[PDB]
Amino acid sequence: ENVDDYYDTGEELGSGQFAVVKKCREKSTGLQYAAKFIKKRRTREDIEREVSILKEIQHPNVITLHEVYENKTDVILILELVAGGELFDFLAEKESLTEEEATEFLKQILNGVYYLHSLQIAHFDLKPENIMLLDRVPKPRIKIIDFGLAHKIDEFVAPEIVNYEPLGLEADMWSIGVITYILLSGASPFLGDTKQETLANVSAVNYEFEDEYFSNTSALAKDFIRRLLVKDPKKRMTIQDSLQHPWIK
Amino acid sequence: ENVDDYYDTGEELGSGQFAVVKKCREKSTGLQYAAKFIKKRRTKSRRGVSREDIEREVSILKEIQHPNVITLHEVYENKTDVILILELVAGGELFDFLAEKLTEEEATEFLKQILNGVYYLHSLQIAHFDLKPENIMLLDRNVPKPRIKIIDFGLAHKIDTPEFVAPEIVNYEPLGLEADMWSIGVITYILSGASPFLGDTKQETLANVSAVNYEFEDEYFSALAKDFIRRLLVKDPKKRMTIQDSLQHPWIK
Ligand SMILES: Nc1ncnc2c1ncn2[C@@H]1O[C@H](COP(=O)(O)OP(=O)(O)CP(=O)(O)O)[C@@H](O)[C@H]1O
Ligand SMILES: Nc1ncnc2c1ncn2[C@@H]1O[C@H](COP(=O)(O)OP(=O)(O)CP(=O)(O)O)[C@@H](O)[C@H]1O
Ligand SMILES: [Mg+2]
Ligand SMILES: [Mg+2]
Ligand SMILES: [Mg+2]
Ligand SMILES: [Mg+2]
């Protein structure tokens, strides 16, 4: 079925390796949507994962799906439009945030993830380029975007089975700590001068609150971060705890 | 769906925690079959199989066809069970054939068939994840070079930022095809009537496995056979022998 029979195509709002997101006006209603053209591999299922999860969720702080189309070589997702650009870009124009602003972005994000975690959904790609503003208001409104790294979480055996250990919701929480750290400072807590180094940094949980940025940061803000950047997932603060943390109160 | 309308039930062919398998005769045609009765999960509860796991078993069998793997004929379902009607394999489990008796050649005759089956499956990016004697069946137990079919696909699967990424994703290695290869290693080895990593506790057994604590005991062994096992029973997955390699191995070609 032909998407050009229902929507008038606008110009791009984003890119990635195998996806273009362009603005799109619905012929019948005049309403504008964000169309995600995901080019299918010609020789996916990751695309049905993404769709089925987008179909399940509805929350003020997550993006809604509207319809889904398929052509010869792209599979198309008509999605809730979000017009205020990326928190990433708001984060660039602002160089960092006061605690009061960080907390009011962070409250919304927390709420979106709470909701998701209540449905056993893990996002697995929480980061500013995937967080989006509605209107760029002095106290702006966010929507979580970019799904499908999102996943529903539930004697002869080989060594890598014997010590398996599956991934979970806790990975999201870790990203939230990394997001918060960036929110309050210029900076990215683990970045090294090379990818190798950054990966080593993340594994050894090797970060500091350097004075250049954190010299006046509240105890409560440091506490919140420290409690989320914790190597063993079972001791990381959960979504529920994070919403009660007195820095969020 | 209602299976007793179309099949006369037979003798129990085998059992498990969540399934029962019986011989049945297709009323239409006289032909015979193996009916795998799988208990459905009541709630999301750890008795029964989930609807998802049952579907994955059906899907994979639906897709495969090769002399060394087993076929799916039809699927029934009632309030309690998902019933899989499977190609019958009449000659018992490799487990029982081993209990009732191996020279290197007898063993080699079995292994190649297994290799052939696993090579087929891998080529479809299906890891089996439960290769063991009780999941290998013989077409007939009374011939000098028994033929085999791999069965029991209940665990089988299809085989498919950094700054923000948690430590356990950084360190995450996915399970893939190499697991099957280790298992073949254990299988080859059981061909001695002896299991390479057995303990006294199931903890003892599990310690052994992840530490790679096997030896070729003089009591059992006494030469290219052991190179084959060794280049398989290896901790780091990515450096085990793959199914193509195992087939190019001099103990094989
Ligand atoms: N609903 C929406 N409203 C406005 N812009 C959106 C949007 N969904 C996506 N975008 C644009 O595209 C990006 C989000 O979806 P995304 O493009 O991340 O899918 P993706 O990450 O799979 C591309 P890739 O994986 O190839 O890098 C954002 O940076 C955004 O600018
Ligand atoms: N197609 C077939 N032909 C002949 N015999 C079969 C067969 N499928 C199964 N059997 C016999 O019954 C047993 C049951 O099938 P299979 O047991 O391997 O599923 P399963 O092992 O996952 C049950 P559980 O997980 O609850 O232990 C086999 O070990 C075998 O003895
Ligand atoms: Mg993205
Ligand atoms: Mg993406
Ligand atoms: Mg079995
Ligand atoms: Mg099984």
Curated annotation (Swiss-Prot), chain A:
Domain Protein kinase: 7-248
Coiled coil (UniProt feature): none
Summary of the tissues where the protein is detected: Isoform 2 is expressed in normal intestinal tissue as well as in colorectal carcinomas.
Active site positions, chain numbering: 125 (proton acceptor)
Binding residue positions for ATP: 13-21, 36, 80-82, 86, 146
Processing after translation: Ubiquitinated by the BCR(KLHL20) E3 ubiquitin ligase complex, leading to its degradation by the proteasome.
Recorded family membership: Belongs to the protein kinase superfamily. CAMK Ser/Thr protein kinase family. DAP kinase subfamily.
Its job: Calcium/calmodulin-dependent serine/threonine kinase involved in multiple cellular signaling pathways that trigger cell survival, apoptosis, and autophagy. Regulates both type I apoptotic and type II autophagic cell deaths signal, depending on the cellular setting. The former is caspase-dependent, while the latter is caspase-independent and is characterized by the accumulation of autophagic vesicles. Phosphorylates PIN1 resulting in inhibition of its catalytic activity, nuclear localization, and cellular function. Phosphorylates TPM1, enhancing stress fiber formation in endothelial cells. Isoform 2 cannot induce apoptosis but can induce membrane blebbing.
Domain-related comment: The autoinhibitory domain sterically blocks the substrate peptide-binding site by making both hydrophobic and electrostatic contacts with the kinase core.
The protein, known as: Death-associated protein kinase 1
Native source species: Homo sapiens (Human)
